């Protein structure tokens, strides 16, 4: 409930207050924090003050005015709505020497083709209109840090998946994606799987963590140190998280995992926040195939196709903090549990805690 806390630029910060924008909601602030941190955001939305301003602020912070080309591209379901966005952007940016434009085209498209050639930091328009001035080469794509899809419900669901995707193609890899929409139906939620990565999801209505999409297995190891040996067998390829219920295990397995050519990332709860943030930035970048850590942040979460419990958490409730789509929202995957002859009980009791089958590992990849 404050902008000043959020270390925004003062030229923008005046614009915010000058535009009249009341201190932002807990939720909005979260989105803004995260857009700025440079994460793909899905943000469920609601009729309320900062509806659009909330992301407009975000795009404006992350702008750099010296670079006089298009750095943010914001697509909306209509010319009209895109003009509102434009005007909003201007208003907030009126103390930033900001340059944006709504591709109305909207005869004259000539004035548009003129306006874009002449330098625009941000650019709004309908997924077509934009895709026009990409084909007509009026809009240079080269230095776009972020794509914003306003009212995705109204676009993504309702005939623009093509128009939008066409644009998407002509943009630098991994350009950042923010999907703002009041509604987020299942139809749209896969959509995002196709252009976002390990996205944050800020939804209005709460969402549990089911166990229901996840195939759970356990490797009867069953004395610690046949656990690494089996892990080694196991990975034979993409991204996965490996939990251990102690920092001592984490470090060991890491130094061993890295003896083996297995590019690794490690984490504790006993690390500062900017550290585990620092780490996960990399792990999410792809530059780590194998995140290993303590729970700490478990009750995390990086959307990951394969999770392994090298150790089984004594506290049962952890189990699904370590593992658990989603619940609507998110992705099925595989858990694998490494179980000491000693820890099979604990497995049975986790099994019973969640009222869930945990079958033995049959040697196959689905």
């Amino acid at each position: 409930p404050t902008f000043d806390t959020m270390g925004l630029r003062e030229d923008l910060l005046r614009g915010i207050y000058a535009y009249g924008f009341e201190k932002p909601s807990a939720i909005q602030q979260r989105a803004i924090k995260q857009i700025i941190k440079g994460r793909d955001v899905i943000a469920q939305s609601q009729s309320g003050t900062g509806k659009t301003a909330t992301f407009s602020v975000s795009v404006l912070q992350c702008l750099d005015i010296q670079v006089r080309e298009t750095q943010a591209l914001i697509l909306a379901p209509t010319r009209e709505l895109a003009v509102q966005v434009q005007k909003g952007l201007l208003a907030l940016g009126d103390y930033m020497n900001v340059q944006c434009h709504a591709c109305i085209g909207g005869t004259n498209v000539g004035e548009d083709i003129r306006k874009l050639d002449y330098g625009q930091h941000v650019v709004a328009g309908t997924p077509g209109r934009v895709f026009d001035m990409i084909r007509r080469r009026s809009l240079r794509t080269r230095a776009i840090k972020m794509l914003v899809l306003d009212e995705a419900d109204e676009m993504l669901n309702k005939g623009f998946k093509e128009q939008i995707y066409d644009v998407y193609r002509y943009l630098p890899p991994a350009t950042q994606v923010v999907l703002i929409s009041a509604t987020l139906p299942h139809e749209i939620l896969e959509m995002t799987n196709k252009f976002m990565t390990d996205p944050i999801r800020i939804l209005v209505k709460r969402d549990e963590l089911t166990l229901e999409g996840i195939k759970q297995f356990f490797v009867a190891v069953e004395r610690e140190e046949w656990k690494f040996d089996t892990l080694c067998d196991l990975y034979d390829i993409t991204q996965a998280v490996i939990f251990c219920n102690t920092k001592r295990k984490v470090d060991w397995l890491t130094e061993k995992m890295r003896e083996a050519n297995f590019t690794v990332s490690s984490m504790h709860g006993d690390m500062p926040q900017k550290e585990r943030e620092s780490i996960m930035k990399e792990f999410r970048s792809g530059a780590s195939r194998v995140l290993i850590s303590t729970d700490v942040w478990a009750r995390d979460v990086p959307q990951v196709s394969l999770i392994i419990n090298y150790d089984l958490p004594n506290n049962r409730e952890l189990y699904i903090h370590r593992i658990g789509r989603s619940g609507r929202y998110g992705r099925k995957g595989v858990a694998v549990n490494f179980v000491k002859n000693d820890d099979i009980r604990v497995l049975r009791d986790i099994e019973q805690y969640y009222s869930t089958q945990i079958d033995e590992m049959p040697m196959n990849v689905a």
């Binding site: 080269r142 193609r169 002509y170 196709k194």
Partner: peptide
């Protein structure tokens, strides 16, 4: 899984 082919600076 969308890609950013058909692009080049």
């Amino acid at each position: 899984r969308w890609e950013h082919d058909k692009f080049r600076e």
